[PDB]
Amino acid sequence: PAALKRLAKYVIRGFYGIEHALALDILIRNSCVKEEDMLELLKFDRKQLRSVLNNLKGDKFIKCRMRYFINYRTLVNVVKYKLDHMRRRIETDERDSTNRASFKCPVCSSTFTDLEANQLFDPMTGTFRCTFCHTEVEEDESAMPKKDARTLLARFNEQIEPIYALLRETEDVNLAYEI
């Protein structure tokens, strides 16, 4: 599991911050990890160390082995857990509606569908007139830039895979090594 500690080297790099990461570095050696030793070594605060440990406990990152004196060992199989749910939420914000180019009247900032201004469509002017005011309609304008968000997320969320490729690959090859 030396390359299992390598997926770990890449997640600490990829995610948790210096204060967390320094503690996580100690977690590297899964031989013996007491609370008094880790406190004295990290040169951290006891309340604060307890917060980080409690945070790591929340990850189920560690299996608190009681004597009382403690020991801590990896539990996260949630690398997929962050993945399946995050991909869902990003694909929700990505998947847009349609051209959804509803007429919108710039004077009253009222919103219409292509259907809304179609009933309004004024045959004497060959264009679309707003309802209560005859001022000509415009594009959905700003409204929801879900299409720009789709493009951005795609570049941004899938652009972090290459830098994660080292670990996405190590994990995959390490899991195969574990059998």
Binding site: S51, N55, G58
Partner: protein, 58 residues
Amino acid sequence: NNQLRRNEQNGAAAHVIAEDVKLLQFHVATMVDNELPGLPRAMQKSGRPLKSLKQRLK
């Protein structure tokens, strides 16, 4: 609501969240019924306890 949204929007210490989740629980259990024993009563004016919804239809 608005101050808890931003406080766990940035990953707080996971300890201010207990004592403010209890605040939210209290505040929302304050609107509906206040005459439940325990639960120190809330007040705004001159010692006026709240007139909860179940208190509005006595």
